[PDB]
Amino acid sequence: DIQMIQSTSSLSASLGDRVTISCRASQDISNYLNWYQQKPDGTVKLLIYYTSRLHSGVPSRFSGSGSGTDYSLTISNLEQEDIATYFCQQGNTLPYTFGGGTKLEIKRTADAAPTVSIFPPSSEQLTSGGASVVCFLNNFYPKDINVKWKIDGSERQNGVLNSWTDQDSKDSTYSMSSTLTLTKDEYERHNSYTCEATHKTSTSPIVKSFNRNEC
Amino acid sequence: NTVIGGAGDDVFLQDLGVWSNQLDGGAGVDTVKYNVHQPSEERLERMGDTGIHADLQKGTVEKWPALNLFSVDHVKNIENLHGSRLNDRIAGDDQDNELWGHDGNDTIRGRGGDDILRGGLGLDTLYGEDGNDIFLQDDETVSDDIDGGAGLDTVDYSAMIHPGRIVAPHEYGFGIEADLSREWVRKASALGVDYYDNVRNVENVIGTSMKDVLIGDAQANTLMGQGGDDTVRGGDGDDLLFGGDGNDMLYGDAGNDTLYGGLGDDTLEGGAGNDAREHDVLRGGDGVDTYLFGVGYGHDTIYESGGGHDTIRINAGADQLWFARQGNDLEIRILGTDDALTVHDWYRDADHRVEIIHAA
Amino acid sequence: VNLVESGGDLVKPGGSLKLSCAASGFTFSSYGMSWVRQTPDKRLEWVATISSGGTYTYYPDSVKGRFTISRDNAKNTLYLQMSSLKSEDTAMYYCAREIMRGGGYYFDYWSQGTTLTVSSRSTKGPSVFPLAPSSKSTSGGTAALGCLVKDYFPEPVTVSWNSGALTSGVHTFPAVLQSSGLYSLSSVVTVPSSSLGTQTYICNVNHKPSNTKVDKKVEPKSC
Amino acid sequence: VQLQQSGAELVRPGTSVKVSCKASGYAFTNYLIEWVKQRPGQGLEWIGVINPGIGNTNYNEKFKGKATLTADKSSSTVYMQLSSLTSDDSAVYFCARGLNYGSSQHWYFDVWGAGTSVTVSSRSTKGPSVFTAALGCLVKDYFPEPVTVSWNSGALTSGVHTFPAVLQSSGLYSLSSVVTVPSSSCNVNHKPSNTKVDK
Amino acid sequence: IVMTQSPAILSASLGERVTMTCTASSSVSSSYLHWYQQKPGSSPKLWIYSTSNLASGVPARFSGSGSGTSYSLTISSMEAEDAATYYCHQYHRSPPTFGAGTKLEIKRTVAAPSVFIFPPSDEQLKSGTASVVCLLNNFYPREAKVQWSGNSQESVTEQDSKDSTYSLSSTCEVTHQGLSSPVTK
Ligand SMILES: [Ca+2]
Ligand SMILES: [Ca+2]
Ligand SMILES: [Ca+2]
Ligand SMILES: [Ca+2]
Ligand SMILES: [Ca+2]
Ligand SMILES: [Ca+2]
Ligand SMILES: [Ca+2]
Ligand SMILES: [Ca+2]
Ligand SMILES: [Ca+2]
Ligand SMILES: [Ca+2]
Ligand SMILES: [Ca+2]
Ligand SMILES: [Ca+2]
Ligand SMILES: [Ca+2]
Ligand SMILES: [Ca+2]
Ligand SMILES: [Ca+2]
Ligand SMILES: [Ca+2]
Ligand SMILES: [Ca+2]
Ligand SMILES: [Ca+2]
Ligand SMILES: [Ca+2]
């Protein structure tokens, strides 16, 4: 079958920047090349069909070009609403194959330091027989961040679940949750629980701790 | 009131009166017409948009359906019928009928035989039924519903583009865009609005004098682009592709296809098998024609004349090419493959020769 | 132009499911319609197209013999019957309108996605635990509080705050597959610290697979 | 000029029935025949029209598939099929002479037939039960209408008020006959049951 | 096209002038508007055809007028033989449509009903069935009210050819125009 290759899987660019996303077909697709935009909420919209024809309601800062096997999507003035994943697709021959997609994120014009919160296991969860320590890191940039858990000073790696929000559509910042899952009996055998965050915005890590025996 | 036609082609202008008439066309091809008389003011008051209910097989034309059952034209040996400017229900016989709906939203069924159906202006529902039927379409944005039925049927869009002012828009630069594989035809196009026909069980499409897109289905199709630079894709099955005048692009796709570039500088591609049994006939005709060939295309044959600068484009490196004489033919093989491109009678004389090859 | 998909559910390997797509805003019977699916790796894949009259159906090799696309032009509905389902069929399923122009095809309008989960694991409703605001989650006039939606299957769950009256400063994280095979996520909202004593905060959790509706009230931790 | 219709028809719910309308006294193939439905105590509903010359027909849309008209030019007779009979089809059916094939056309129904009573029901033939001042009788249960009530061998006909029969929920019929008598001072007959009661 | 007749019931004393109307949802031609008369137990008869022409045997006191959507039938002097139901009929367009009908009755001086009760027969109670009969005799107008719910069936006779009264039975509080207050029996 015809393979659609987008060399870039993810890229970050600034507001007002000119952004180009490339697409390559394994065969000549005779300009039958379409571009689709998937917003972070999952909705899919057609931007361009037939290499360069703009769909109705698509802003004129979107453009397409190419021929043969090489095709390009161009955003002339990157805007904040353009955070999305962009797919190419050939409509020449069955099956109508899609490119792997290119996730586009805003390169923020300033870094943002994380604010860190820690939530001990809920009284309701402990009563039900579980234990989850939740570390909440909020409104930071860039997305890269390292989280280290310590139980009574000793580092704990197993049972840690990490999750990130999509880039904030307005602030262009990221949020993160690190959840340390423990058996309820093991949680009540130790007292000190520490969440350590390392981020570009500080050479010293952010330390957030609580003591199970201190309210 | 009785009317007997002669042995030749006769045309009977029939009004929508309330009396009962007897019509016999006799020998020859004979037509009754109901679109010349102006419908009376009383009939417009009481009949509204309802036209005639005509059944050539039953031999009756009801001029006042429901309201006056006496008002019936009894016909025999009449092959063709033309409807009214109102909504008609027309049914042919098992003979070859020409059935025109004219204005109004008409339902027309041809029954057996090779019929010619022309809905005319309006929202028309056209059944070809048994036999090889032809559907003549007209310059209009209003949608039509065409069912070819059994047999080899043809929808014809020549009348989309005519001398004088053209009503329907064609702002994308195309006459029609026909997709038998999806069972519709884009008959007209403007900025932000499209106009489609529903076409089912129709095997053949005749284009306009402008650029057309003609896409076939899995059956054996005959697609004729006519004037303008056309784009024709036959799809699966053994298709017959006609470029006509202009610089056309013909793709046979899978199946054993036959491509006629016609006049002009045409690009002919026989295609590749979908899965050995892939033999395409490429006849670029007059003009500077380009033939496409590649791995998996099978054994295709070029027929040329006039000895021009026709070119061959092969999706393979030049050092992969292998030339061999076969009788009087030149045979271009791709090394490592069973694919072979034959130029018919290449060695007989210069007229049949193709001497320019673009390689990848 | 509007396309409303429905029918996604959890099915054990080898089972069947039928999705529907209700169309409106255009002449449904003039257009070829299609289904497109998105696998967890975010890759998109065309899975079926049907002709406007329903005579012709087209499928990729990956679903041929197992999927059947059909349409009811009288009811403006498109269907996709699936059988012999495998784990590889787990995806978000979209229904789209197909267009041909100049010889090539594209999809000009899409529905939203519906979730097909192919797994032998049984449906489990989540437990909802409050993440109470405290001195350890309060700094600079802002307090963080939230809800822990733990140990459920399959996806998805929806979370709102105060029945949709609190939409600003909400961080509902993507679920994480735990080693137990069950999902878990948290929703954390940032509010002003002054409001902790006078504003009640409630998270609403919906897990339609298990018919679980939970309104958890998140109270501040006092010392 | 008259239109002779068929006799009363009592049939089972699921069956069909033909009713005839024989014409006489005029050129049969020069007048359209129309059919009208009248439910007990209801208005007039147009069924359809037939051209007896060619067999051409047109129907009310709500009777398409239920009514079917045919004509026999040799016998000068017009027929009507009722298919898939229902309690909502129990009515009187009239045939009327309609449009003339001529120069003066006005589309009126000038000659009407007597009407063919069609009553469809699941019940079977059943016999009646019998139960100043005023006395009276009571006929509680009988299905094949009608009964005739007379008082004192018809010698008494003043003050008598025999009421119209009423269809009870069970499917049979009932009525009451009453005579007003001086303060100082009953023959029932049901044909289909051959039951005659005097009290 | 949709025929509406007014009124549903028309009451007229002897010698009184009578006018009933029939309106169409759309304009119909006078040539294709007809009237029919029907009495109980008989077929309808053509009465007035093409708006204003009397059929054969119709007395000269009948007349009809109208155009467009508004048509009427008039009797210049009410007679007992005129009491019937009158249907207007359009054939301006197909399918032809009839009106709901106007029941023309004879108006009379108000006559109060005579009420009687009949307990269930011991012959009837042998079969375990109990039917109680209430009788209203020789009353006018027809409109009455009889309550004892859902376990009774009413029945009224035709207007009497002699005294123009009605008789009703229900199988007992009675409310009627002639009764200054409901009479129980
Ligand atoms: Ca002739
Ligand atoms: Ca002839
Ligand atoms: Ca016509
Ligand atoms: Ca024919
Ligand atoms: Ca035919
Ligand atoms: Ca027409
Ligand atoms: Ca047409
Ligand atoms: Ca045919
Ligand atoms: Ca055919
Ligand atoms: Ca053309
Ligand atoms: Ca051409
Ligand atoms: Ca084909
Ligand atoms: Ca082919
Ligand atoms: Ca050409
Ligand atoms: Ca081929
Ligand atoms: Ca040529
Ligand atoms: Ca040539
Ligand atoms: Ca080939
Ligand atoms: Ca040449």
Residue numbers in the entry:
A (entry chain A): 1 to 215
B (entry chain E): 1056 to 1330, 1337 to 1421
C (entry chain B), D (entry chain D): 2 to 52, 52A, 53 to 82, 82A, 82B, 82C, 83 to 100, 100A, ...
E (entry chain C): 2 to 27, 27A, 28 to 148, 156 to 178, 194 to 207
Give sentences copied directly from the paper behind this entry.
The characteristic feature of RTX proteins is a C-terminal RTX domain containing tandem repeats of a nine-residue motif, X(H)XGGXGXD (H = hydrophobic), with the X(H)X forming a 3-residue β-strand and the GGXGXD forming a 6-residue Ca2+-binding turn. ACT contains an N-terminal adenylate cyclase enzyme and a large internal hydrophobic region that inserts into host cell membranes.
However, the sequence expected to be the 8th repeat of block III, consisting of residues 1325–1333, was excluded from the β-roll and is present as a loop between repeat 7 of block III and repeat 7 of block V (F5). Notably, the linker regions between blocks I and II (L1) and between blocks II and III (L2) both connect their adjacent RTX blocks using the same topological motif as L4, which connects blocks IV and V. The linker motif, in contrast, introduces an additional antiparallel strand onto one face of the β-roll, and therefore introduces a kink into the RTX domain between the two connected blocks. Specifically, the structure of 123cap bound to the neutralizing antibodies M2B10 and M1H5—representing the two neutralizing competition groups of RTX domain antibodies—shows that the two corresponding neutralizing sites are L1 and L2.
